[PDB]
Each structure stands twice: as C-alpha cells, then as structure tokens.
Write a protein that binds this ligand. Structure first.
Ligand SMILES: [Mg+2]
Ligand SMILES: [Mg+2]
Ligand SMILES: [Mg+2]
Ligand SMILES: [Mg+2]
Ligand SMILES: [Mg+2]
Ligand SMILES: [Mg+2]
Ligand SMILES: [Mg+2]
Ligand SMILES: [Mg+2]
Ligand SMILES: [Mg+2]
Ligand SMILES: [Mg+2]
Ligand SMILES: [Mg+2]
Ligand SMILES: [Mg+2]
Ligand SMILES: [Mg+2]
Ligand SMILES: [Mg+2]
Ligand SMILES: [Mg+2]
Ligand SMILES: [Mg+2]
Ligand SMILES: [Mg+2]
Ligand SMILES: [Mg+2]
Ligand SMILES: [Mg+2]
Ligand SMILES: [Mg+2]
Ligand SMILES: [Mg+2]
Ligand SMILES: [Mg+2]
Ligand SMILES: [Mg+2]
Ligand SMILES: [Mg+2]
Ligand SMILES: [Mg+2]
Ligand SMILES: [Mg+2]
Ligand SMILES: [Mg+2]
Ligand SMILES: [Mg+2]
Ligand SMILES: [Mg+2]
Ligand SMILES: [Mg+2]
Lengths: 217, 93, 50, 245
RNA sequence: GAAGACAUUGUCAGGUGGGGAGUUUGGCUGGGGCGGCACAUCUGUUAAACGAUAACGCAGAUGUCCUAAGGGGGGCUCAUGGAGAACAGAAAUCUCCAGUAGAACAAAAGGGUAAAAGCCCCCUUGAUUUUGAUUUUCAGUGUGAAUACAAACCAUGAAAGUGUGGCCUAUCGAUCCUUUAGUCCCUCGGAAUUUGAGGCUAGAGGUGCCAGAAAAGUUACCACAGGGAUAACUGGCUUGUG
RNA sequence: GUGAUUUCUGCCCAGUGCUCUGAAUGUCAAAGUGAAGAAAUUCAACCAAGCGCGGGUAAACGGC
RNA sequence: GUCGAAUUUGGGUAUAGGGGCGAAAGACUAAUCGAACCAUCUAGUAGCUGGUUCCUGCCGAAGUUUCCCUCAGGAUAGCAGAAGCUCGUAUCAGUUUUAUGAGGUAAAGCGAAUGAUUAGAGGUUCCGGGGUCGAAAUGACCUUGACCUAUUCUCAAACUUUAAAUAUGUAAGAAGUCCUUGUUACUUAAUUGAACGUGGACAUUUGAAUGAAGAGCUUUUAGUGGGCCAUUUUUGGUAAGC
RNA sequence: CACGGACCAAGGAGUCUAACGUCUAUGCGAGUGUUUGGGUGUAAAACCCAUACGCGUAAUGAAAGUGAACGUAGGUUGGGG
C-alpha cells in the first residue's frame, strides 16, 4: 500500500524483539520474516508478476549453494570455501534421476557458470524450478564471494496460484532503524510490483520465525 | 532497439546547468472526463436530436509509433523528454 | 415502397363485413333471476338460414 | 486481347503462406490442364483461358480449398474478355490476431486476442490461454475486414524451464502452464515468464519454442488499444522447432 | 359480477427496428471496369557532353534496422592463387611468397575508401542545451533531409584535432481535440485560501487519396444540363510465289 | 406458398433464419448500494430484457 | 373473341397523394402517374449552353510553373496596360575577341580491365527455399531451384583509356592601384595580421570590339491557364494523319 | 453536309446598396468630422450651435504588466539645389 506512518511497524518490531530473546532467549534462529497477502486479484485472469528486489542486508547466513561450474570456477569456489560441483559430477547427477530430487533438498539454492547454465535447463532436469532453485549465473571475472553474498541476500516476489507470499525480510537480531528501512523497502517493492499500486495489498505481518503472536501491522 | 536505463546528459535546472546522470523510463498518457473543455463541449454538441455531428477517423496507415524517453535527474529531480525514430521492438535492458 | 395490402385492411373502407341479409346477432338470453334460481320455458318458432 | 478469360489470384501479404499452400495444391491435383499462359505478379498470378468454362470451374475449385472473395468484370474489344479478381483472406496460419468486439462476442463470446490455428475453405481461430476455437467464414470476414497484429517474422525464441498442467484437453491439445525464459538473457538475467498455453503435451523442459513477446512491442492498432491492460499476456507461444540433425 | 394496489397512465433508461427518413457510394487511365499506383519518395537509364525535360517507358527499391552497426583513439590488411606440414581425403589447423582492392562497409543502385571509411581491441554517450543563417524541391511558401558558424556543457586522444547520429544519395505529416515536460510563471474580472479549469514555451497521439472529407449497390421504369459518334484518303497504301 | 386429375415427392438442423417445458454470470444501462475525499467527483460491488452457451424446426431459405 | 353468366350497365354511396385502389401491367387515380393538380417559399442553385447595343486613336498577350476530391473550375508566378516618381548618358547587352574553368554525347576504341539474354545433360547427407501432417523426431510426405561443373566465338542507351563541333560560368579597374599610419573587446609568441579608415600620388587611353531607341525605381489591375504546324535530334508501338 | 437567322417595327442585358484596397481632386491640418439632437426659417431647402463620440497623435505581450534622445535625434557611402 501507500505508506502509512510506520511507527506502528516500529512498535511491532520492538514488541517482536522483546518477544524474541527477552521473553524467550532461544538458540540462534533469528529470522524476522514479513508475510504479505494480496487482495482483489484473480490468479488466472491477471498476469503472474514477479521480480527480485535484493537488499544487501542479510539474515540467513547458513545457506547451501552447490556452485555448479567448470574447472576455473571450481578452483574459485574452493577458494571461497563453498560446496561446488564438477562436470562429471553433474553428469552423474543427471544420470541418477532420484539423486536430483534429493540434492534439491540437501541444498538451499544454487549459483551456476555463465558457461554451463544454458544446459542446466535440460541436463539437470525438471523439479528444480518447481522447487524454485534455478541457478543464477556468475561470470568468469566477477567475485564469487560477492556473488554468494548476493545470492544469500537476494529476495524475490513471485506470484503463485496463492495470494499469500511470505519472505524472510529481516532477522530478530538487532538494528531497529535498519529493520525499519528493510520493511519500508519491502513494502515499496510489493506496492510497486502489484497492479494497483496501493489498493491490492491487504495483510502484512511480522513474525520472528517462532510462531510469535506479535504482528501489529 | 536497446537503450540503457542510465545516461549522462545535460540538464537545464537552475542548480545544475551541466552534464549530470539521469535514469530512463518510457512515456505514457492519461485522459479526463468531467474536466476538459473539449470533452465538455463535445458532450453538449452530441446531446439531443441530430446524429453524430463530428468526424470519426477510421483510415489508419501507420503500424508503428515513435518512442519518447523521460529522463529524471538524480541530483535535481528535473525531468526531460527525448524522442527517437520508429521501431517495432523497444526495451530498456 | 408503398402501404401493402394487409396494412391497408385495417382502415376498414372496402374491407368491412357485408351485413345486410343477416338475421341479427346470435347470442344467449340475458342472465337474470329466473335463470339464476330456477328455469324458464320458451318455444322455437322457426329455423332459418343466415 | 487474345484469350477471352483471365483469372487473377492475389493475396496482399509479404509472406504468402496460404498462396504457396494453394500453389502446392494446384500442382498436386493438376488443375492447370487448360491454361494458355501464366503471368507472375508481386502478390499472386494470372491464369489465362480460351473459353470461360475452364475459368468458372477453376473458380469452383478455388471456392472449396481457400477462403476467397471473387468479383467479375467485363471487357470490350469493339467478343468480350472476362476478368475474375480473386482475393485470398490475408490471414495465414500461426498469426496473431485481435478481433473486433462484436464479432468476438457473436462468435461464441471468445476472447479478442486469438491465434489463427487452421485454414480451410473457412478460417479457424483459437484462444491459446484457454483452449477454445471458432470458425470465421470468408463472407463475414469480407463484410468488414481487419488486419493481423503480428506476422511470422517477429517470432522470438524461448527456452522452456519448467512444465505443469491443468488436466483439461480438447483433443490433440493439452492446456498446460509452463515457465520459460528468453535465450537472449538466460545466461544474463533472472527474468522468467509464466505462460498458460496449449503446448503442454508437446513440450518438455529444456528445449526451444517460438513465440510472440508482447512486452517489447510498439503496436499502433485501435483494436489493440481498445483492450484492457491486465487481460493481455506477455508471451504467446506458437510452435516447437525440434531439429533432428 | 370480475380484478386489485397488480395492470393502466406519465417521465427517463437499455435492447430491437430498410416498416420509414435523410445522405454518400475517390483520382489517374489508348473508353469505363479488373489489374496496377505511373497518387508521397530513392538509384541507374530514357536525356540529345552546363542546368531543366514527358509516356500505364525500362531495370529495381521505401513506410525498416542498430547502445552499436553512433563518437574518439590504437594496432593490423582484405578476396584469391601457388608452394609446403601425421591422420587430412574439393574443403578443418599452422608456415612462407604473390596479391590497386578482383573483399568488406544493414538494405536497391550509383559514387567513395588501404598505416582506411575495412578487420580486431580500449574508453565512452555530441543520438546533449539555446536559438538564428544557408542548400535541395521551390511561389524561392510549408513538410522532409542536409551544410557551415556562434554561445554552453561534455567525450576521446600524448597531441594537433575530431564529434550536433548512421561514409554520401530515400526511410515520412497542419489546424481543431487529448496528453506530457518546463517556468519560487499568468488568469478565473467584489476580496481571499485550497481543489478544479484555462493559458505560455517544447515534444508525442494522424491523416499512405501522404498541402491532410467521416461514407454501399442497382436502374431496360428512368430524369436534367451539356459534349461527342456515321462511304475509306495511309501527305499516296493494295496483287503469285513460308 | 403451390397451382385440375394421375404418379413420385429421398436424405441432412450443419450455414443463415425462426423458435424455447434448459443451465447459470459470461457480457451487463439508468436508478439504488458502499468506500475515499472539504466537496464537486473518483473507484468498486450488484446487475432486467437482449446477446452468448444448450435444445427444436427443411410443403423455412439452403445443401447432397 | 365472347354471348346466361367470376355477365353488361344507370343512379346513390365509400376510399385522397408517400395516400387510395389493383384477378399484379408499376397499371389506374379528369388528354397529367416509378409519386396527381393548384398557389406560395422562388427572380431556388448551375465549375454547363446561348446572347450582351456608338466612332476614332495609341499600346498589346496566353494556352506555361506550384498547390487543390483538381482534369469543362480556381488560387499563385509569368506574359500586358495605366499612373507615375527620382534623376540625366549612367554601366548595360538573346553579340564578338582575349584570358581562364566545367562537361563525357558524336566520333574513335573494345581484342586495354566490364565481352552479354535465348533453348544447356547428370553429379544429395557440398544447399534446400518453403508447403502438409505429427501427444513431436532414427521425422515421414512434396516440388522451383542451389551449383554449369570438362563449351567459345560473339558486343553494349543502363562498359570504359582518348575525346570534337554546337551550347555554358567568370574577368577585362575610380566601389581601382600604390605609399604612409589610425581603430578593435577578433587574431598572433610578438611591434603579426584581418576588416574599415585619415593623409598623399595617379584623367589627351580610366585599361579589348560593336551598339545604346534615355537610365533606375514603385504601386495597381485586365485577359490567359483546351493549343497546333514545320526542319533537325530522339523514346514506345511491323507500323499510321499512332 | 457544326449551331442560330423568312421579313419589318417597338421593347431588350455590368445596375443600386453596406463595408473596403490603390490612385486623383478639394478643405483644414496634430488634429479632423455642423445635419443623433437643438435654434431658426421666405419651410423636406438655406443659415447657426453645445456636450459627447468615431478615427488619428504609442507600442508590445496569451496575460499580469511595462512603455520610446549617450550624442548638433549618431557615424560611413552616394545625393538635387
Ligand atoms: Mg438523448
Ligand atoms: Mg358496418
Ligand atoms: Mg402499478
Ligand atoms: Mg429500418
Ligand atoms: Mg433508403
Ligand atoms: Mg475515372
Ligand atoms: Mg484503359
Ligand atoms: Mg544535362
Ligand atoms: Mg560506421
Ligand atoms: Mg526547407
Ligand atoms: Mg502532430
Ligand atoms: Mg488528396
Ligand atoms: Mg495531394
Ligand atoms: Mg441520362
Ligand atoms: Mg438451424
Ligand atoms: Mg451504472
Ligand atoms: Mg441476463
Ligand atoms: Mg341461354
Ligand atoms: Mg393514412
Ligand atoms: Mg389519365
Ligand atoms: Mg458566347
Ligand atoms: Mg504594335
Ligand atoms: Mg558511339
Ligand atoms: Mg585615400
Ligand atoms: Mg490566374
Ligand atoms: Mg477553358
Ligand atoms: Mg445551318
Ligand atoms: Mg433554322
Ligand atoms: Mg426570330
Ligand atoms: Mg543613418
């Protein structure tokens, strides 16, 4: 929606950050996600819109991106200390059909080589895109550590058959004003992505991954 | 045709008066009903008995359109317009 | 065009009925007290052509 | 002035697909038995005939293969030459069409934004978003004619990423829903499109398919701009390439 | 007796409505019509050694394409032939010699170009702002296209320089009406505030019949105002031999 | 509409018409309803017949 | 032809003009009918046909350019008349000479590089243009053509090396030349230039010929905008008074 | 061998008005125009007159608005008398 004097979200973020670790000092699982449900739009009758609105603020540090690439980016991935893959390894992955549906679950994402990604379309077969894990390409001269940071901090709004899109927009760690900036950026991106720029958005909720009863949005 | 969405050109704002950086979008249009003098005149001429009273054009010959770019200054927020030739496919990659 | 014949038949100029030799309108007796409560007897005097 | 009958077949399109189909069918039936000569033209050809009987039976043959409209003309030398102007409906198969509103409502309340799916003695349109066909006749076309939105030169390539389905089929066409990308930025961007199409039974993930890209298009058409903005899609997929070797 | 706050009647609104009314149904053209566009444009020829010059003359093109295929700089030489090298065999990769362009430069044709205008790299946005003058068509009007300066701001290069889109010759559009950008802008006339509206400067939305009406037939039942049609004479042809 | 008597009048409801003991929002005007607004207004839902979908009809026009 | 009836006929009565009546011919409705007659609007409009009334004097054309739903018509420029005005032999010419440019036709030459249409035989994974099917690819079904392969003489208005004649641009001075030194915010490293000047010198010829009916300038308006014939050079049609 | 014309007389076709352009004549001249009206009369004539108003003496801009001498009302080249 058109923005609505975000002190209510400020008090909601303060109540959420006093819910996490000040009434339940649990183990380190900080992810203050924003769930947004849209109203007054038909999925089949309207266009299924999508975009990615990558904010550099990060909240999910433990991620799995099995870098699939060639030899030079394999050495670059071994330098960047992340789980890589080889060409014969990916050939065996396309050989065993049950291994792909499991490697899509043991990983959290993916990051491909601008020299082998125009094949993951067919070699690494379907259900990777159905699990929404189509790999993003990385060039022969871009920074692999920076690309891994971007693929860990890149959020994407996609219109499915349901109107209940939720995104890991923040962590419950700290930085109230930076969290307010993140909430403003996410609300701006959703409002600009929807067809009517204000009217369609109905439900906004904050939850710090703990089934907390503090939304107040 | 491909045009990038960033461009350094001259802006004539009173603060800048030099070459600055702009971002690029495409131009579109609107309309108005209980406002404009032409519509308010046409509706009264159209009411009553008499028929249609104005011409109606149905002999279109062009198949394409010129494209206009709107440039917004990042340091001034002063827009500017620039027209291009006739093309069939346009994007801002 | 002009006014066609089935349209012309409604003004009723040369299309009216030829009623000179007709004996009168044929209808039942008017309902009254005697027919409403009991009966009444008449006699048929002639059977004619219309 | 030496024949007495002329038949002039025309089609006012640069890519004369229906006309080349007609030429293949005339050559494969050999209906050109009694032609004096053949004159080439820019948009068709003229057949010559010594008497008008072979000409009128050529008209009789052409009236049942292709959607045409024919008109007759009379010449004088001072005994009368005859000229038969035949026009083919200038809409070919796999072309993208926006329909007039009254015609679309009267032809089964179909969408205006259709694709030409089969050409016969009549012409057939189909909605690619929801599998549904319609038959337009040559006379109801030529009563008030219109043009096509895009021809088969701005067909761009697409790389199929993923397939789904909806279960509904109408025979030979399984209406499904596929996610796809462009082969000019598949290795560049993260831009994916979601298309509900009728290429579900024929396509599997990882290959190339032709389509119309509406999001990069300068259309100057009053029938198009009288539509709605949300109910026109981004991509319309038409055909799969599938080269063996 | 029957019917009953329903029909009926009044006003507005949506369908239907050749039953009826009014009107229209382009131009060029070896007669009209069909066909075509010779209707707005470009190259070679017609065209007769300045310029100008017709035909439904001839051979063809235009309503596009390009963030580089625009701008600056650097390095290099192309088509082709010959002689050599494992598999190698018309033809795969490497080496040398010859090579005035026989290649390439988006598209028709003509012109132009070799330490380049071609090919390969590097940096960029001058395809920017403000307005005058000039050339072609020409009434020396408009539209389109182009040329040379001025006043700014930039790019490139060590620099001199070059750069106001595409090496040159084509690639496109008034009034009225909408819409957009810009002016701590002007007006709403008894006086103010805020919406709304109207103006000024510069672009887009289009008229291809391209100096730019909103438009289907038939008449032998026909009408009016006019203009044209009739023995063969080649300024001299016709008879027996492809 | 056909045109005394005699004899024969086949098959197709698909196209165009004409029709309706059928389904339900697909299109859907004024009036009324709701939301935002200082208000003029703007947006939205609902929405009659008709059209569309579905059935009937050829001594209807047609078609073979 | 028909002549006892769907008969013939007098009088009375009814139906009126976009209306009547029709055993149907667009027939009949007072010699009027594919919309009667009468008066008015009305002296309706006409890019179309006809006509347009005394004498003498002086001057005297055009059928061509551009734009137009333009082609039997207009606007615009040209050609013509009239009124004059500022001055007085100018510096001008449908011409020659001298000097100096530009051109690519006639002729030459092709054989010096371009030397051509025409009917021209196969060589399939050297190409293949598309067209039809296809729950799609060890994918079937089709035909113009790709490429003339081991064929040359042959010649050009859209081929070139040379290149007339005829026609064509400019100059042949006083608004000139030379010497000296003033201005400037332009230009130069500069006291250099550039443009415009002050002062001084140069008339028997002041810078080739011949001519010059006075020269220069302004306003306003008519008609015309269907042309045709002849020598020569040409284009399309065997060819024509085409 | 295109159209009109048998003959004679009489009649018979660029007019008037509103608003203008160029040129000419006249009156006054930074002004000019008495005639809508009033006074008077030998009575639709002639003669006389106040206040206004029209055009001219200032332009430019869509408007709000602003509004014409550096100087012998300038310098150079010609220029009749
Ligand atoms: Mg009304
Ligand atoms: Mg009666
Ligand atoms: Mg009632
Ligand atoms: Mg009607
Ligand atoms: Mg009518
Ligand atoms: Mg004509
Ligand atoms: Mg002709
Ligand atoms: Mg010439
Ligand atoms: Mg270039
Ligand atoms: Mg011009
Ligand atoms: Mg315009
Ligand atoms: Mg025109
Ligand atoms: Mg024109
Ligand atoms: Mg006639
Ligand atoms: Mg039916
Ligand atoms: Mg409503
Ligand atoms: Mg309904
Ligand atoms: Mg008898
Ligand atoms: Mg009546
Ligand atoms: Mg009569
Ligand atoms: Mg006359
Ligand atoms: Mg004379
Ligand atoms: Mg010669
Ligand atoms: Mg001197
Ligand atoms: Mg004239
Ligand atoms: Mg004339
Ligand atoms: Mg005569
Ligand atoms: Mg006579
Ligand atoms: Mg007479
Ligand atoms: Mg002066």
């Amino acid at each position: 929606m058109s923005k609505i004097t975000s002190s209510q979200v400020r008090e909601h973020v303060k109540e959420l950050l006093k819910y996490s670790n000040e009434t339940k000092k649990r183990n380190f699982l900080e992810t203050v996600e924003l769930q947004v449900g849209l109203k007054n739009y038909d999925p089949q009758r309207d266009k299924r819109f999508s975009g990615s609105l990558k904010l550099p603020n990060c909240p999910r540090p433990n991620m799995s991106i099995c870098i699939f690439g060639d030899a030079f980016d394999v050495d670059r991935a071994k330098s960047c200390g992340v789980d890589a893959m080889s060409v014969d390894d990916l050939k065996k992955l396309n050989k065993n059909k049950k291994l792909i549906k499991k490697l899509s679950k043991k990983y959290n994402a993916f990051i491909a080589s601008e020299v082998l990604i125009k094949q993951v379309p067919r070699l690494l077969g379907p259900q990777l895109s159905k699990a929404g894990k189509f790999p993003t390409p990385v060039s022969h001269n871009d920074d692999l550590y920076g690309k891994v940071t971007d693929v860990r901090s890149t959020i994407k709004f996609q219109l499915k058959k349901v109107l209940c899109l939720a995104v890991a927009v923040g962590n419950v760690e700290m930085e109230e004003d930076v969290l307010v900036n993140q909430i403003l950026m996410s609300v701006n991106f959703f409002v600009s992505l929807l067809k009517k720029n204000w009217q369609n958005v109905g439900s906004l909720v904050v939850k710090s991954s703990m089934g907390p009863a503090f939304r107040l949005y | 045709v491909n045009v990038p969405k960033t461009r350094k050109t001259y802006c004539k704002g009173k603060t800048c008066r030099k070459h600055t950086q702009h971002k690029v979008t495409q131009y579109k249009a609107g309309k108005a009903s209980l406002f404009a003098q032409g519509k308010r005149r046409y509706d009264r001429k159209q009411s009553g008995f008499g028929g249609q009273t104005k011409p109606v054009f149905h002999k279109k010959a062009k198949t394409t359109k010129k494209v206009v770019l709107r440039l917004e200054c990042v340091k001034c927020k002063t827009r500017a317009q620039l027209t291009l030739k006739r093309c069939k496919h346009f994007e801002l990659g | 065009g002009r006014v066609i014949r089935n349209q012309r038949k409604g003004a009723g100029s040369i299309f009216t009925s030829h009623t000179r030799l007709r004996q009168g309108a044929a209808k039942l007796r008017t309902l009254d007290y005697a027919e409403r409560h009991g009966y009444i007897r008449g006699i048929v005097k002639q059977i004619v052509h219309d | 002035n030496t024949w007495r009958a002329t038949v002039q077949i025309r089609q006012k399109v640069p890519h004369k697909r229906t006309f080349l189909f007609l030429e293949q069918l005339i050559l494969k039936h050999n209906a050109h038995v009694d032609t004096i000569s053949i004159s080439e033209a820019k948009d068709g050809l003229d057949f010559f005939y010594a008497q008008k009987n072979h000409a009128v039976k050529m008209i009789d043959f052409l009236n049942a293969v292709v959607p045409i409209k024919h008109k007759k003309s009379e010449e004088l030398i001072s005994t009368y030459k005859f000229s038969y102007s035949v026009e083919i409906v200038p809409i070919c198969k796999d072309d993208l069409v926006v329909l007039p509103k009254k015609l679309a409502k009267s032809m089964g309340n179909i969408s205006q934004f259709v694709l030409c799916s089969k050409i016969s003695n009549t012409v057939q349109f189909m909605d690619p978003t929801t599998l549904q066909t319609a038959d337009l006749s040559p006379s109801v076309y030529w009563r008030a004619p219109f043009n096509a939105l895009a021809d088969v030169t701005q067909l761009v390539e697409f790389i199929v990423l993923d397939v789904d389905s909806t279960g509904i089929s109408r025979g030979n066409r399984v209406l499904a829903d596929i996610t796809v990308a462009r082969t000019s930025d598949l290795g560049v961007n993260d831009q994916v499109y979601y298309v509900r199409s009728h290429l579900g039974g024929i396509c599997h993930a990882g290959d190339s398919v032709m389509g119309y890209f509406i999001a990069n298009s300068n259309y100057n058409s009053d029938l198009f701009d009288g539509l709605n903005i949300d109910y026109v899609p981004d991509v319309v997929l038409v055909k799969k390439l599938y080269q063996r070797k």
